[PDB]
Ligand binder design. Structure first.
Ligand SMILES: C[N+](C)(C)CCOP(=O)(O)O
Ligand SMILES: C[N+](C)(C)CCOP(=O)(O)O
Ligand SMILES: C[N+](C)(C)CCOP(=O)(O)O
Ligand SMILES: C[N+](C)(C)CCOP(=O)(O)O
Ligand SMILES: C[N+](C)(C)CCOP(=O)(O)O
Ligand SMILES: [Ca+2]
Ligand SMILES: [Ca+2]
Ligand SMILES: [Ca+2]
Ligand SMILES: [Ca+2]
Ligand SMILES: [Ca+2]
Ligand SMILES: [Ca+2]
Ligand SMILES: [Ca+2]
Ligand SMILES: [Ca+2]
Ligand SMILES: [Ca+2]
Ligand SMILES: [Ca+2]
Lengths: 206, 206, 206, 206, 206
């Protein structure tokens, strides 16, 4: 476990082999979650990349957040996809939170502490506990099958993940830097594994 | 009688069949009224939808508040329509208040705490007290016959009603979040009937 | 003697027959004056309309403040017209003051607290004392001959008149809602005559 | 002498014979200087005009500040011109300060308390002390030969002249209204001379 | 050994010949660096220019910071060029910090306090100690061969240079005007050498 407070991982050029592998302590399968993070890149109006990748040996897009060109954000759990379109694109660092709850199948998508309309996705699913979480590359198989054309080029940081659903208040206090307490993934106690060209440096966002 | 304070009704997907039914304790006909409510959708650029529908065995558009793409707001009482045009649309939650008075025929339309000019409509009409009030769908008959192309997808909440016309000071403190006593529909003691795929969640607006 | 404090005349529909008559305790002819007032409409982009008509049996446009579509404000005194151009038009309530002085011929025109350049007009003229002052229609004869295509739809209020010229400091306080004492027309002690479909409602502006 | 605080000269309409004449206590010839003033007109989109005209017997443009339509500010000392370009032109009051130095030829031009870049002009020159200074007309000879189409129509005031070069700090206060004492021209102690149709009224800017 | 505080070098016109030489107390070769500075010119929408030229005997563009019309900033070290596109251009003083690190190849580029994305450039390289550092002209040879069409017209100041990489806290303090202590070039103990029509005047930025 390592405190990465104030730091970030950076991926400086396109590649096929660079990535960070987060280890989570899961034992029970997920019936809801929240995930939040910060990232910064110029890719957005030239191609598309993977922002967060969650995979079991049985499904490779279990949960996955992804930017795709000329459309917008693309959230998917259990192989099924949903869209939040962005018309105007602009360059600056971005903070997102994203949550999903089985029973209702409602997903919320927060961009910079403002929320998008709610949507429905895979009501009643339960997400698998033995997983491969990966920054920088997109998985087409447990642990691997990366695609250079889906690479993150820039830095990414502040990834935290809870196994329940954050309320609008709590997402405001994470956004503003207030203390929270993750129970699946904690930036102040990370357990990760690096490979290829990725550096750890100070963060460009407040 | 339920206190819906700080909660809201969320319609996650398009339907023919999901809606909420508000039970209002009306005795006399209405000679004047004032209605207000919050609502958040991204439908506004693809099609129209009903925000508030109030129907009667003789008239299905007794009072109806409706967004119509590429023109703006439509407000109709007694099957008669009046139009507040809205040049530029943006996506964000909005609060509106609206009111009509038999004696003068004057309608006020308050968007986000700012007043539109006054317009005249249905002078001397009187609104029925035997009614069906529905959220989530437009009515074409007492109690149903829903249009999916008029479905509202998104959140709606804080609906309140008065048997008299509200004043500018009063609307302001509604907008600002001050206490009120509403006497026809009251969001802190609400008697409703819910049907379909609609859920109840904490509100995204402040 | 009526204290019209916090009220406005509302003309809710286009017509030929609704108006208000102001009674002015005139005795000496005018060699200089100042009038201010509030108003609010959506007509500005469709057609023009009259805001303040001052008629004497010898001249129907003795002092006439007019909005003409596609040009701006039109200020005429003594049948001579001077033009205050406005490029952008927006729907919101607007407050104006306007002055004239016989000795130098200089007119001022203030919109929402800011001044337009001074211009020359009717030096040496004297304005008549026995006259008809009408809100809502345009005059072509002492008290009569209305064209509907020049009528005003919307609200009008806080009209006040002095018989001298206000200083820039004075006009600022009238703007911020500070106190003054008019000496020709006084809104807090208004003597007037109503005729047609006009109502008297609380004012939309602060 | 005269204290002209809070007053201004106003030229109501275009003419061939109006202007005031400032009288200066010059003995030595100028090896530098700095001039500041306020003014307010709409002409700038129709034609150009003379803003401040300092002439000598040998040279009708010893120093001149001029607005040329479509191009921007024109500034000439000793017959030779330099430009500060201005693309967008909005009608409001404006404050200019501008200063020249012999030893380096450097000129600065401040508009509303903000500086344009530095340029070079008549390095080593020496301005003549027996000048004739005119507002509201352009000189083509000592105190004479006016062109009407170079006329200024509107308000000018607050003109002050030093015989050295003001620092950034000193322009700032004078812009902000603070006190700093001129030694060639002084608005609070003006010796002048009026001719034709010009008036003295309270100023429009703060 | 000079303190240049509150002052800037100023280049009033276009030339082949005017420039400033900065002398750096350099013995070991650079394996990393930061450099920061202020400038102000109206050139940016007519042509390009050089902001900071660093040249070695073997390599005339060892480190160089250049504005290219229609594109944005260009930054190159060791001959290799990298681009930070700037879409919209505005005339006003601007402040840039830039840095490079042999070990990882990461360059950073801060404009007016806000950071741009990290890129990669000449990993492993080391920069040379015996340099010619020049302001106002673009070196094509050790100490000369100036392009009149790559010349800076305007002011420039506050140039400082470290031999390590400044953290974001440090770069904000510099931007806000805080104190710092540079160790390769120092505006407050500057040892330099001038040539041509160039002057030293108080800075136009605060
Ligand atoms: C394009 N898409 C976002 C709809 C799905 C692509 O996912 P993938 O092939 O990398 O795993
Ligand atoms: C838009 N419109 C108001 C003119 C028609 C809507 O009618 P409806 O769907 O209640 O029948
Ligand atoms: C001055 N004007 C051209 C704008 C309008 C005059 O109208 P009218 O009062 O004669 O009817
Ligand atoms: C400003 N200008 C130098 C371009 C015009 C000068 O005209 P003039 O002084 O000879 O009358
Ligand atoms: C910025 N640039 C690469 C495009 C120009 C460099 O030009 P050069 O002057 O060293 O010959
Ligand atoms: Ca995949
Ligand atoms: Ca893939
Ligand atoms: Ca209907
Ligand atoms: Ca219908
Ligand atoms: Ca008339
Ligand atoms: Ca008429
Ligand atoms: Ca001349
Ligand atoms: Ca001339
Ligand atoms: Ca070169
Ligand atoms: Ca070159």
């Amino acid at each position: 476990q390592t405190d990465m407070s104030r730091k970030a991982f950076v991926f400086p050029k396109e590649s096929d082999t660079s990535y960070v592998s987060l280890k989570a302590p899961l034992t029970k399968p997920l019936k809801a979650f929240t995930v939040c993070l910060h990232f910064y890149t110029e890719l957005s109006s030239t191609r598309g990349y993977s922002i967060f990748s969650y995979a079991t040996k049985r499904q490779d897009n279990e949960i996955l957040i992804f930017w795709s060109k000329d459309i917008g954000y693309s959230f998917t759990v259990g192989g099924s996809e949903i869209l939040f379109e962005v018309p105007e694109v602009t360059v600056a660092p971005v903070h997102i939170c994203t949550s999903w709850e089985s029973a209702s199948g409602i997903v919320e998508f927060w961009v910079d502490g403002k929320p998008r309309v709610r949507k429905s996705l895979k009501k009643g699913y339960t997400v698998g506990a033995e997983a491969s979480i990966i920054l920088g590359q997109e998985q087409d198989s447990f642990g691997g099958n990366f695609e250079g054309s889906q690479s993150l080029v820039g830095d990414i940081g502040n990834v935290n993940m809870w196994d329940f659903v954050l309320s609008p208040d709590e997402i405001n206090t994470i956004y503003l830097g207030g203390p929270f307490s993750p129970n699946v993934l904690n930036w102040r106690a990370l357990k990760y594994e690096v490979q290829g060209e990725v550096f750890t440096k100070p963060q460009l966002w407040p």
